[PDB]
Structure formats: C-alpha cells, structure tokens
Amino acid sequence: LRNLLEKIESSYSDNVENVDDFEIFWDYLQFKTFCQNSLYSSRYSDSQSNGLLNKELFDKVWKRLSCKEKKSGQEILLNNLVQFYSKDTVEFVEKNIFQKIIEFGWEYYLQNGMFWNCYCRLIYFDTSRSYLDKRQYIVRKIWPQIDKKFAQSVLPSLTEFCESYFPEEMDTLEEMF
Amino acid sequence: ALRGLDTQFLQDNTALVQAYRGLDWSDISSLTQMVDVIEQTVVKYGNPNDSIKLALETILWQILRKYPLLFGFWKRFATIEYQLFGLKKSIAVLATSVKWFPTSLELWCDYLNVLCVNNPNETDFIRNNFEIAKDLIGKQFLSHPFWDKFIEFEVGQKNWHNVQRIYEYIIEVPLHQYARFFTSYKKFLNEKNLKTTRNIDIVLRKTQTTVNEIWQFESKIKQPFFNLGQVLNDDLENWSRYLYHENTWMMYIKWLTKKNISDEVVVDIYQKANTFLPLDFKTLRYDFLRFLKRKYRSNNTLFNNIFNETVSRYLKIWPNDILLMTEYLCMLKRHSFKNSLDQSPKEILEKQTSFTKILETSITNYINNQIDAKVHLQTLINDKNLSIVVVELIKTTWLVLKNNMQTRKYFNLYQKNILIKNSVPFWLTYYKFEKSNVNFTKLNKFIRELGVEIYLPTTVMNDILTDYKTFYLTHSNIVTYESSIIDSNTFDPILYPELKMSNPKYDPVLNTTANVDWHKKTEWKEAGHIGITTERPQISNSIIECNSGTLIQKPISLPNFRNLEKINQVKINDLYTEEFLKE
Amino acid sequence: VFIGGLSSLVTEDELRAYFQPFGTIVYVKIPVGKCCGFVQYVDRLSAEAAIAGMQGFPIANSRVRLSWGRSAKQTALLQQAMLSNSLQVQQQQPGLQQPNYGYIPSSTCEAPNVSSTMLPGCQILNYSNGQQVIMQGSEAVVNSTNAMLNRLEQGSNGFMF
C-alpha cells in the first residue's frame, strides 16, 4: 500500500495537493496519514497520534489551502483539522492555521461560514477548557474578528452553531451583525 | 368533514323548526348546536351566517345575537352585510346605545371601509349619525369618506355638497383636493376592479377564484404603495382570500415587511392566517416561528408568550415534527435564564444546573406517564419528541458541566428505552461523544452493531460509516488496527464499512453449511425476478461441474430430479392489494 | 415499491432517508392513517436493490414488509373499480426509450458550469431531486461529502432527522 501511494504521488510529480480532482488527493491523504501514524511515534501528550498534523502532511494540507477559490476541496480538508480534541493540538491547530489565516487575511476563508463555525467547534469541544473560558473565549475573541460586511454570509452558518450550543448568548450574536 | 351533509342537516333541522310551526326547544337547541358545530368545523361563508343570524333573530335572543355577530365577524374581513346587519341590529339598543353603535360603526370602518363596495357602510353610518343631532360627526364622516377611493365617490361628493347646505364650503381647498386625488386613485384602480368584475362568477373554474386578476390587482397594489395602501393591501388580501391559496398570504408577508408597518399589525396577520389557512400546509407557519425568534431581538415577553403558545398549537396539529421541540427548547433555554456572561461564575452554573434538573425531571415524568401542568414542557414532550430532549440533556451535561461519568451513565440508562432506542440525534450525539474521547473500542462496537441492533436510516448509516472510516484512518495506526480484529468473525474498521454501506443487514458470516441448506432460500426461488417466488425444476445430481475428462472413469448415473411438477406453478403473495386496496 | 407495515410514527422525510442511498427517487406519497407507504425510483435496478436491501428492516420498532405496488393515480383507477368490481385493466409504466449511452442506472446526484469530456468512466447525465443535470465527477464527491459532514452536525442537534 505505501509503495502504491508512492506510485500515485509520483504520477503527479510529487504534487498531489495541486490536483484538480479532490477524491484522489483525499483518498491518498487519509491512507497516507494512516501509514505515518504507524511509522512515527506520537509527539503529543495524552498519547494522541498526530494524524494530520505533521511536517510532511501539514505542509501538504497548507499548500492545498493556500490556493483558495481555485481548488475544490477546501472546507472538507478543514473540517478534519478540528478533530483533535485536546490541549496541545487545539493550541497547535489554533495558532498554525486558524491564526495565520486571519493574519494573511484571505477573503474567501473569512467570508465563509464553515471556517468560523469550525473555528468555534475547535475551541468548544476542547477537553482542557472549562465552560466559562470556552464561551468567553468564543465570544470575546473569535466573534469580534468577523467583519460586519461579511456578516450576511457568515451569520447563517455561525448561527447554527450558536443556536444549538449557546442559546443564552444568541442575543449578543445578533447585536453584532 | 362533509360540507353537503352539514348543509343538508341545517336545512332539514331548520325546516323541522319551521315545519313544526312551534318553538320546539328540542329542535331549536338542535339547530343551535348544529350551527355551532358547523361553525367550528368550517369558515362560514356569508350566506349560512346570514341564515343563522336570521334564525337566531326569529327566536329573539339579544345577547346571543350580539355574540353571533362577533363570531360572524370572527371569520371574515371584507363582509359589509354582517357589519350592516349589526348596525341594523345594534341600531335598536338600550342605555348603552349611543356609544355602542358608534363603536361598531367605528370598528366596521376600521375594517371594511377601504373596500371598493364599502359605500353602503358609510351611507349607513352617515344615516345613523344623521338620525341624531350629531351633525358635526356627520361632517367628520363625510370628510373621512371623501378621502378614500370608492365606486360611488362622485355621488357621495354631490350628496355632501347637497346636505352640506349649512356648513358646505367651510373648508373648500382641502376637501376638494382630497376628493380630486381620491377620484384619480379611483380612476387608476378602475382597470383592476374592471378586470375583476369581468372575471369572477362561479363556473367552478379559475374564473370563480379570479386568481389572475387578483394577482394583478395585488401586484399593482404592492408596487404602487401610498398612504392607506397598508389597509388597501390587507383589504385586497382579504377579498382575495374570500374566494385557501397561501401564496397570497406568502405575498403579503413581504408586503408588510417592505412597507414597514409595526410588529403589532404583522403578528396578528399570521395569527389569523395560521388558524384560517388549512393544516398540513406548513410553510408560513415555520416562517412565523422564525419571525418570532427574529423579533425577539427587542426583548418582549409578548413574543415569548406568542411563541410558547404557537408551538403548543403546532405540536398538537403536527406531533411527528421534531424541529418544533428543538426550537421550543432553544427558546426555553433562552428567555427563561439569559446569563449574558456578565454574571458571577457561581450564578451561571446554577442557572445551567437548574435547567438540567427541570429537564431530567421532565423526561423522568414523561416516561412514567406522570404529567405536571405547572411545567409547560410536560405538555409538549411527545413519544416522538422525547428523543432530542434526552439528547440536549446529554449535551448540556457533558459540554456545559464537563461531567463525563454522569453523561455515560445517561447513555446506559437511556440506551434501552424503546422510544429513543432508534434515534438519529441520540446516536449521533453518542457518535460525537465517543469521537471526542478518542477510544475506538466503544466506537467499533457502535458501528458493528449498527445494522443488527441499533436501527437508524440508511442515509445516516452511510454517514457514520464513511465519517468513521475517515476518522479511523486519520487518528489511528496499524499497531492498534491489527490487534483490533478478533478473526472469529471478519471485521476490519477500514474495509468493513465499505462492504456494509448500502447493506444494513450485512453479516460477515463464514459457514460451509449455507451450501447444504441452499436452494430452499427465497433468494434462490426469486433470482431473475424479484417479489415473485417460482419453484424451479432442477436435476438433483448435476454433472456440469465435473469435467468431461473425469467423467470417462465411471458410467454416469441417471439424473435424479426435483421440483419438476411445479414448472407452471408460480406464486405471488400480493402485498399491495390485500393490505391496501382491501384494507 | 409498496412499503407496508410501517409504524405511522414515521414522517416521509425519514422514509426518504431510508430509501435515498439505493438510487435517485421520484417520490409519490405516503398515505395518512393507512400505516403503509410506497416509494418510486427512476430505474428498476434501484428498486430491486431497495427491495432486497431492506426486507424486514424495522422502522420505529416495526418489522417492515415491502413488495411491489402501483402509484397514486393507478391506485385511484383501481379503487374506483374495487367498488364497482368491473375490469381492473392495468396500464404499465412508461419506458425510457432505450438507447441511452450517458446514463448509469442506480446512481445519485447529491447536489447541484460543466463542460466535460463525456468519457465512458465518468457519469455523464443524471437526475435531480425534475431536471436532467450533467454530473461533474470532481465536484460531485466534494459536494456529497460536504452535505455528509453537514448532515452530522445538523442531525446531532435535532434540526435534520
């Protein structure tokens, strides 16, 4: 299997991340992940293997994301970056993508509601945080970083997160936009 | 639900009260009861309300006649025959007369005076005021109707210039200008009214509904919106609804949002239409829940009450819809606590735990057939709707309180309940819980029990199997993987979801004795044709497996047959005819 | 496919969830109070895959018994004859006028500019939940997975069922 993954990555001249058809890059990337979990011992506490966070694969993912509107996969690759559910990895994925993507400030990812919904669900399912710093962190920081002109697109998807999980703070969401 | 039956019963009962020639209190009470039941069942078009009002007037009951006028004005907007029927009534009155009749005239004016046929209401009110010394009030009424476009408006202006012989020219410019603009608006709407009156009559055809002319009149009314055009829009919507097409109300919804009329007038529209418009339609109703949740932004207990009661009605008329209990529980978490994160840390956790206790004690009573009317949720919770209630108990316990053991205890306690045994959100919440805590052992047992015991729909099964395939490939490794297959049965988390996807009942069973028991199985009896079980002849000992090189050793035995009598026997259990057509 | 033996606690959008993956559906109706519904697909291969796929599969703790049955209008034409016991002459469903080189039976377009190569391997034409759409092989998988990951988040919290 690992040989055959080498063969299919050699077909594209060692860029699978630039492929037009997403199913090949995704099926390649997840089985590649399943291999490098076994090869390299886990770097992170709680014994969690580093599946999709690795210098080899995370550079692949980030190169896939830097293309923005031109390449199809996008949010599907992003949703699986929220799956880590710990301290070390919510810090890692917080700083190394969700923060850098704000600093470079790309418009496609900021207008998108799936981005902000997942960046809320990444902090919200952390097992390290209590409820107070979790909701206070989502409201005091995550939300005000949204621009009011993006709101019309961002509100429907980001309401669905707040409607279910945070009925209490639903109002301060509506007052912002 | 039969209109002709209730009409025949009304005519037969009334002809019994008249043909009996007496009051016949049994026949009178029977006629009143039949009329009340028919009025509760149906929308009571103007004719049967006129007959019922005539019958009650013949019996001479004043207060009962006052109530049936308000119940007749209950279902209708545009009827001037009921209003004029009350002013003709209520014109003969008691100590409260003077103020009573002006109240009914003023309210009837608020309703139907903007209509095109509404001239007789202004004529009757002007006659009622002219019966008195109230000539000031008659001049006020004459000035009011001249500003509105009506069919007879010119003859009303000449009658006003005529009976105005005392105060006539008192204000010439405002009255003449308002009459001129009213005449212009009438001339503009004369084309729509003409296309209407040239359309509507009952052929039992689109002419009777006049849907095209009504659509054009409503289009002309909404785009050219000026002054009373809110009341003109409501009048046109009412007259259009008098002939239950809800894209007319679904036109009106945007009309009152664009022209910016206060919420008090808008919410009453949907409060009337939700009752008027038939059940099972259910689009504008959800849009009304969305309107309430949207207007909650400016905080009012009024919208919370309208929401709580409205959800109480829709849940009764639609018991099976699960979205209503999610919306209602969201508003119950919302309006009844409102933490806002400015409070003390001990206070918010109390407001959450109290909610948890109300919810747990709610479902505990709901499963044991105990109902507490004090808690409103007890009335709403349903055998279909209990699922997401338990699910939000799980979600609040685990996410908000960060209590894991209580939560897993709730999974085991509520896993065996029959109602929530098969639930989409319960097992998706368990899938997300056993995803969060990374252990695969519980979750493998979740996905391998998914077709045998825990029964979800197939679209959701494909979802857990695919999403868990990806999750397992990403977060696991080989050392964990190869240790995870017992091999007593064939199961692997990578491959097994791919074989189990469209097959809910797929069982990876390895057995040689399925070969011995073969050809008595329904899959054999129907092979090339499904649903139809033929009995097919075959040779018991068949040589087609043995090669011709291996046949020449021994002489071949004669063929033994089976199922050779049944070649023409082909049987079908017809499950469409006998359980549906036969009932 | 006539699906009998339902619980009548079930909605129609739940039944669609059951019979969706077997193929594209042109739905008919679920009767009220009769505790038996029925479904209709585009292609018979998907129908048979649904009959063999789900047989005796409990929906709301009721073993389901499903077989072949007609649609609503032909049901009306039958029920008018059942009272008058006259003929009951059936009328078969319309065919697809078959050549079709672009369509692959028992396949779904999971969501909605396409200029393709029209090569054999890819699925060229398809149906929409009544519009014939050209299926883009690259975008169809990412759309289907997008709706898949949405269906989990909405399904867990009670919005979708």
From Swiss-Prot, chain A:
- Write out the annotated subcellular location: Nucleus
Each HAT repeat occupies one of these ranges, namely: 3-34, 93-125
**Transmembrane portions of the chain:** none
Q: Where on the tree of life does the source sit, at the highest rank?
A: Eukaryota
**What does this chain do?**
Essential component of the U1 snRNP particle, which recognizes and binds the 5'-splice site of pre-mRNA. Together with other non-snRNP factors, U1 snRNP forms the spliceosomal commitment complex, that targets pre-mRNA to the splicing pathway. U1 snRNP is cotranscriptionally recruited to intron-containing genes. Required for U1 snRNP biogenesis.
Subunit structure, as described in the record: Component of the 18S U1 snRNP particle, a subcomplex of the spliceosome.
Query: What other comment is given for this protein?
Result: Present with 1730 molecules/cell in log phase SD medium.
* Name of this protein: U1 small nuclear ribonucleoprotein component PRP42
Originating organism: Saccharomyces cerevisiae (strain ATCC 204508 / S288c)
The shown chain, on whole-protein numbering, covers 364 to 540 of 544
From Swiss-Prot, chain B:
Query: Which is one Pfam family of this protein?
Result: HAT_PRP39_N
Q: Where in the cell is it found?
A: Nucleus
One GO BP annotation of this record: mRNA 5'-splice site recognition
**Superkingdom to which the source organism belongs:** Eukaryota
Q: Which GO terms describe its cellular component?
A: commitment complex; nucleus; spliceosomal complex; U1 snRNP; U2-type prespliceosome
Q: InterPro entries, from UniProt?
A: HAT, TPR-like_helical_dom_sf
Keywords (A to Z) from UniProt? mRNA processing, mRNA splicing, Nucleus, Repeat
Q: Where are the HAT repeats?
A: 51-83, 85-117, 121-156, 158-191, 216-243, 402-436
Q: Which SMART domains match?
A: HAT (SM00386)
Keyword field contains Metal-binding: no
Function text: Function prior to stable branch point recognition by the U1 snRNP particle to facilitate or stabilize the U1 snRNP/5'-splice site interaction. Has a direct role in the assembly or function of a catalytically active spliceosome.
Remarks, miscellaneous:
Present with 4460 molecules/cell in log phase SD medium.
The similarity comment for this entry is: Belongs to the PRP39 family.
Protein name per the record: Pre-mRNA-processing factor 39
From Swiss-Prot, chain C:
Q: Name one GO molecular function term.
A: mRNA binding
Any one GO BP annotation for this protein: positive regulation of mRNA splicing, via spliceosome
Any one Gene Ontology cellular component term annotated for this protein = U1 snRNP
Residues in coiled coil: none
Q: Which UniProt keywords apply?
A: mRNA processing, mRNA splicing, Repeat, RNA-binding, Spliceosome
Domain RRM, chain residue ranges per copy: 1-71
Quaternary structure and partners: Component of the U1 small nuclear ribonucleoprotein complex (U1 snRNP).
Q: What is known of its domains?
A: The RNA binding domains RRM2 and RRM3 are required for NAM8 meiotic function. Within the U1 snRNP complex, the RRM2 domain of NAM8 is positioned to bind to the intronic region immediately down-stream of nucleotide +13.
Comment field (misc): Present with 1480 molecules/cell in log phase SD medium.
Role noted for this protein: Component of the U1 small nuclear ribonucleoprotein complex (U1 snRNP) involved in the initiation of meiotic recombination. Involved in the formation of DSBs at recombination hot-spots through meiosis-specific splicing of REC107 pre-mRNA. Collaborates with MER1 to promote splicing of essential meiotic mRNAs REC10, AMA1, MER3, HFM1, SPO22 and PCH2. NAM8 interacts with the pre-mRNA downstream of the 5' splice site, in a region of non-conserved sequence and is required for efficient splicing of uncapped RNA precursor.
Name assigned to this protein: Protein NAM8
Q: Which organism is it from?
A: Saccharomyces cerevisiae (strain ATCC 204508 / S288c) (Baker's yeast)
Task: Tell which residues of the whole protein are contained here.
Answer: 315 to 522 of 523
